[PDB]
Subunit: 231 residues, 6 copies
């Protein structure tokens, strides 16, 4: 039994019952195989240097993530990436956490099908990064469209070559709570109770974090990866 640490890189703008649900799913799955033992889950909010449209301050995303995991036994938040001045490629974030653990459980990227399929977006990922991520760390991709993910893997010689290191976990409970729809809801003043944890909902309301204004941040700006990989 290989000891494993699930590392989820994402914006968590805001984290929702779905992001937490991701970790629960992956763990049951990996433990389920019998060849693994999930020892820890790490949430690592992206730094504001990412420049994603509508992205609020990493400070709030970390806090929410922390509040969301306050009662979680095995999942926690790591603020290293967010406190970085420069936007860090996910490969580097994976590396950092592997090297950290050697101061040995293997670190795997926890993600959804959107992330996996974004590999095809021109210039979004350095192709070597793709190879090294799946080759040297591996993905645990959770999804409600298991077949599209499986099809995407089958259509890429690189992903197919390292398929033993890419695990597609089916989500049979059609979870669709996206960050975007949560933000839309708040702007219109609708309830989001039961879509995010109580403390996260309470934290958000109290400070009216999301608004038309916030949704506008980085508007007109190129996504970090895109700028760096074209420049």
């Amino acid at each position: 039994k290989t000891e494993v640490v699930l590392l989820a890189c994402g914006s968590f703008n805001p984290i929702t019952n779905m992001h937490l649900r991701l970790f629960e799913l992956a763990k049951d799955y990996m433990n389920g195989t019998g060849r693994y033992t999930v020892v820890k889950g790490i949430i690592s909010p992206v730094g504001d240097a990412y420049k994603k449209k509508g992205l609020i301050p990493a400070y709030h995303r970390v806090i929410m993530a922390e509040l969301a995991t306050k009662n979680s036994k095995w999942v926690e938040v790591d603020t290293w990436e967010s406190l970085q001045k420069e936007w860090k490629e996910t490969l580097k974030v994976l590396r950092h956490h592997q090297e950290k653990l050697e101061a040995v459980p293997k670190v795997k990227l926890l993600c959804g099908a959107d992330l996996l399929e974004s590999f095809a977006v021109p210039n979004l990922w350095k192709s070597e990064d793709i190879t090294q991520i799946v080759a040297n760390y591996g993905l645990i991709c959770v999804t409600r469209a298991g077949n599209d993910a499986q099809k995407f893997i089958y259509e890429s010689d690189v992903l197919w070559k390292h398929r033993s290191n890419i695990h597609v976990v089916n989500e049979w409970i059609a979870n669709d709570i996206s960050s975007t729809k949560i933000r839309r809801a708040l702007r219109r003043g609708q309830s989001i109770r039961y879509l995010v944890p109580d403390l996260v909902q309470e934290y958000i309301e109290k400070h009216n974090l999301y608004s038309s204004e916030s949704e506008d941040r980085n508007a007109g700006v190129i996504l970090a990866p895109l700028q760096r990989n074209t420049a």
Copy 2:
């Protein structure tokens, strides 16, 4: 502005984040129209006499229902229906809760999902005069991710179309079908249901080891009360 009470009659076996979500959605919709003011939400678990397959004992359901709403300022649980000896037609439950409020009165509206609305078509499941009285004298607030289907269903029925002003279809754009069936199945397999139900409900289920192959077989082969009654 009309004050209104949303009454959700269901099995809640078990209740999940989605049932709680149904109430939040319906209240936002109603208050948002500008002509209503939602004052209270009432969860009324069905009596064990319903005989639905896999239906665990009514008392546990009420508790999880109460646990899930312990921190709910406006939604509460009512045990009147579950305490009755014979299975209770939804129309009577609605009536009971309306008479009860008249003691300037708020109106009780049946809160439900599309499946319940559409079940009106199952032969011998609902007495036709009951449907008529429900939509005419109380009304339905139907939450669902299949809006056209609910609208179509209503459109295909003369009685529903006729009382269409008393039937409100509320769209759930943030789909999340956390159904009881899938929760029960996850539990039978020792999978986590954390974040699918409120923490206290999860824990309650844990401790009492509520769901299993055994519980799921309850009533196996027994005809559903309504069907049994309405056919006799």
Copy 3:
């Protein structure tokens, strides 16, 4: 009860039973809610300055629309828009009619999901026009794809905000009869009997209205709204 005037701006190239049907449905719906009284329907053909491809001359489209409503006891044609020298924004046509009335029924725009959704085409509609149209006048969107329309409304903050003034009318008897299909059938010599009013059909035949030639009109030209919100 609020009196209302249904106004439909469009090309009507050519008007079909579908357009007339649109008015009947919107009227039934608005009078059905119990809180409106539809006192009139107005068809306003777009001027040739619109420059849409295949658009035949305005006078032909006005006459056909007039022939079509000759036997309507409540729907009529208004030629203001079509007589202006420069193409006119729909907000301007709505405003013209609302004022002409105040010389009071409320003018509401009658349209299909199509136009509703063109609100998203880059540079087709000025964002303030949309806000003013939905907030100050109103929209009655008649369509077969009700969920698509509802969804479109849900996905936009302005529309959602003024949703109380937007009405989606389900067309349960799915009819299509698009102008494009009618011109296509005419080019092929196929029968359009029962798809348009006999008088319109007879006129189309008398003047041999539609052909490959007519179809090339404004070929290459940039649609007025676009030329204007760009240029």
Copy 4:
């Protein structure tokens, strides 16, 4: 070039613009093949003994069809079927018309939609030899918005496939689904059906209040003539 007569057997309860289009489309298609010449169209309302649910008196349906075709240069109404005390099988109506033409003779083909074609699979509705003789000795011109389905249906039936040269599937690219059922529903609800049926038909219907809750109940609980007779 083979001269053809398009015969449409149906309830026409009531006739709508869709039934008229049907003839237009089929005529264009047959003439467009370069191998046929459509000389006449025939609308044949079914007699009351068919016993279909909601079927109003035959005499009215006949009058509506005549009103509907008053301005048609080539489609006409035949009452033979409406005057039969015992419901007649479509194969018999086809034979009746062909024998009539015989009195260089045009061939009678059945004009219908996908619904009638696929109804061939309903248990007991059509005697198997009837299906065989109709497709082998007369022919079908099936108009539909679902061409692949109709082809699939044909492909899945040894008899249909065998005689596929006599079954013409005609694509309806301008979708039209003005069903009689949706027309009656509209009328019961006091909705406008203008532009969905010809003006004279709408006017006749409105003048005599032909469609209502009561008319819709006609023959409720009764078994459709073909089914009763083929199960006897």
Copy 5:
């Protein structure tokens, strides 16, 4: 590395390129996992006592299967099952082959989604049988409807419990050369060249194997398993 024998029970009425393809796919998948070595493939035609409608005599089906595998280096036909007088439960056919080997490679059932899904048909399979098959042997399900097969496994407690002994193999190159379609094609005189091995094709033509008559076989008769488990 576990050695495995893929056993496929079926009617093979007639066998086709797709049944052969099934074995190739399963083999590539199982060997590809890096923890299996497929040492043999076994085609076990069903006996005539099965009474399935349209089912021609076993001797013709066995012979066609041998002609089909004459040129296979690893797939062969086993006639045991078909030589029995009473129709044999698939679990028994499996137990048989496993014991015959123990005279050790593990035998697994090779099948398509249909068979897997027919596990839900009332009275078709004894539930103890379903449990012993997946628990004691294994199922390699090859299919175009991967997610459906997966959903079906997810919806059954028995199958889910032993999911580790069940492998859904995706068939990215869609094939649907069903026997039913082959028979239908033969009845109408259509070519089946390139859908079945040339020798099978030649055999079918020489003995005029399929027709309306043959299709009538067992018409009205109750399929053996239903008869048994029911009476």
Copy 6:
């Protein structure tokens, strides 16, 4: 009864069972109408000047095609195109074969829906060519998506006008053995047995024809037709 010659122009990179099926289907269909007699089938591999990505040498494609039709009674391979130093438009290939016959059966282009639909790709086919192909020769289009091909025809005035020369043939036994998927399987060391003829699979295996390298042939080069028609 008009005699007809089926001419399939294509890359055949490599030829598969599906291309062979195309001929069987088309022939059963045309002879089935009762008004045509299919006298011959011609497979015509494109020349290397076509420059399609992943196209291996013409000599090999021609050999695989010869190997595949060795035992065919009526389908042969014509090498004219493969020997052209300049890529030839399909209209010319049709004209080459038609005059050759006039040295009288009519040659018709056999193809699938992809090819037919490619008629709409900007600059791929000269409009006059499309016209002449369907006006003067004819297309027999075999496909799993008949309505899509029928709709494509209905939406084009030229195709519709000569619809009597375009025969859509339904493929009820769904088969999608694309060359792209065959090459994918080969690069991955997967079996392609029973998807292509035995001799073809053996020739491919013996020469390692398909690989990552072969797949890069012509990368970045513009397809002959596009280059020529844009120039």
